[PDB]
Amino acid sequence: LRACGRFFQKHQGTCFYFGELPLSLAACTKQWDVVTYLLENPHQPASLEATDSLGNTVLHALVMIADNSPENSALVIHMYDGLLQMGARLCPTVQLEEISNHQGLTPLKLAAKEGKIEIFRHILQREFSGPYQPLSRKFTEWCYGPVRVSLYDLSSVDSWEKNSVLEIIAFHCKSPNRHRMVVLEPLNKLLQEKWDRLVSRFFFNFACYLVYMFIFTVVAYHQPSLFGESMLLLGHILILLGGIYLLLGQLWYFWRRRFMDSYFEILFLLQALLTVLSQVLRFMETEWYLPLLVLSLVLGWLNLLYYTRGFQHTGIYSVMIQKVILRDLLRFLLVYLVFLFGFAVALVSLSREARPYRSILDASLELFKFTIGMGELAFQEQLRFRGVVLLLLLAYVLLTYVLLLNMLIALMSETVNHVADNSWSIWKLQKAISVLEMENGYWWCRRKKHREGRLLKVGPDERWCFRVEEVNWAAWEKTLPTLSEDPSGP
């Protein structure tokens, strides 16, 4: 009896989304005796694979009620494991983990999309011994003393499939916990493996872009006044070809992905648009292409800072300036402006009388030169109101040199609690985005996606696996079984 009302649906406000199904309610409400009675009974058996109006089964409902609190996460983990074990003994023919809702996702995918990290980490590294062996994802291969190779499962986790946990985390997710689902194993080992296979193409792209930017700098610097001529026209044609190529690439990227990590692609689009506009304005014989070409050159040299992600830990510096350039700067500048204009107008309104600051623009420039430590504080004599002008100049100096101090103190207090783990996780997330972007290939030719791990039977189900080696000097029990009796390293 589906309770497809308004209070039971998932929305902001007074709600409690348990999946509008009595078995789902008993599962979510910590009523394991009631769950056991509802799952098996001679009168009315409740199917565990039943779906509500949205298409969610009980596992999706258990995923969607999970918070990040430790008290609720233990409930979600224990009830998920218990329901999986009871589904093993009731309907073993059907695989109830792979049941998809109307959006098309699975409970692992749903935990990835909504940002429920506490059930995601458990479902990615769950291990069950005894009779419930095949429904595990943390298989144990050979162990030789303190070193053991653990085989994780890459079913619906590798990027070879049409929809993956990696793609959902990188692009489709929307949560503050996007970066924290990349550090956890086996996603740390998986994305480190694909990056080492793609760093060659990343550096090749860096070299090609550096050659293009060197050609652009040579063309811009040796621009004639508004063999050498043929070389310059060949360079202009090459710049036009590179600009239209990069514009087509960015257009294909924005068509495929139909925000902070998306900044540099917007800068790439702006740079390509500006150089294409500069070339088409030069072709139209307009004397305004030179500011646009120079602006494109400046924007491109700024854009070149994107390729610092792959130079090892350099990115952990660079990500901070990204946060810095969205911390308060675009506000604080406005605060500086709402001084400047006012004071500038004041100076003009007090400098048009006689017994310097002629217009608003010159007054603004002479007021701005107190920040770079260059402006003058001379005692005027030609102006009639010398003392009031000096008093306003001193007041502006004091207000600027206290506003900058306040800004620096505020930024220090903001960054003093910033540990290195968060910045490292942000850099790892950016590398994950770059890996999943390059693996799709260029727009003019699509790369052949290759599997990772190997296909080996576990207990005769053929399950893809990824091997992670570990050393543990405290696991001296030798009780868990091993699939293979031979080490057989790579």
Added chain:
Amino acid sequence: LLQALLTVLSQVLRFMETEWYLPLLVLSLVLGWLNLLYYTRGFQHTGIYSVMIQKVILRDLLRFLLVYLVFLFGFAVALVSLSREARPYRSILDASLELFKFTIGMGELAFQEQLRFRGVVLLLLLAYVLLTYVLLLNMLIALMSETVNHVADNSWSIWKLQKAI
């Protein structure tokens, strides 16, 4: 080794009557006065200061300067590419020097009139000023966050290791 090699080369160039020994002798003198900071290890705890600048001079400086360079050259070229027209910054070297003087707090932000593109030149100068004064702030914040967890025990141990050597 570099100081000894430079002063030996300066002496052998003076013996060969070459008028290029004077830059090498002066460079050797500068390098030697820099080298004199090695002997601060034995002046008690003074070394616990000095070791930090060693880490500082290998922390990010030789990278960060390059980052500063990959602005400067670009912007400098831009200024040259926009200052050769008429209705200042003559060559690449003078443009680089006039752009560098915004870091020591000496460069000028005047409104040009002889150039045809006054507004675009001013906009690029303002953009360079903002980018420099945010990059230096970011560098200082990053260095502070790097050194805030640096206890005195690690620096004391480093100084003791240098004294052991």
Added chain:
Amino acid sequence: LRACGRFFQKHQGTCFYFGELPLSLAACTKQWDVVTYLLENPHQPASLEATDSLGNTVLHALVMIADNSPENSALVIHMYDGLLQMGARLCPTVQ
């Protein structure tokens, strides 16, 4: 019987360098009863001063497996002290 293979040598990758010697393996694997049985027995006595291909004895192997973790360091310290004490009572003439 020296296990002078490739998996048992010390190198980056899949390795477990215990010294390629059964007494060394029992010492490194926290098997003090097996170590006591191998050190003294009427059938086949294992010399504590035996060396592998690299020339390491059991003490060098106990040194090379030590990490900086507190759980492993206690194992290395206790097994080193126990092997030194058992070497005192078996071959006191040699150092």
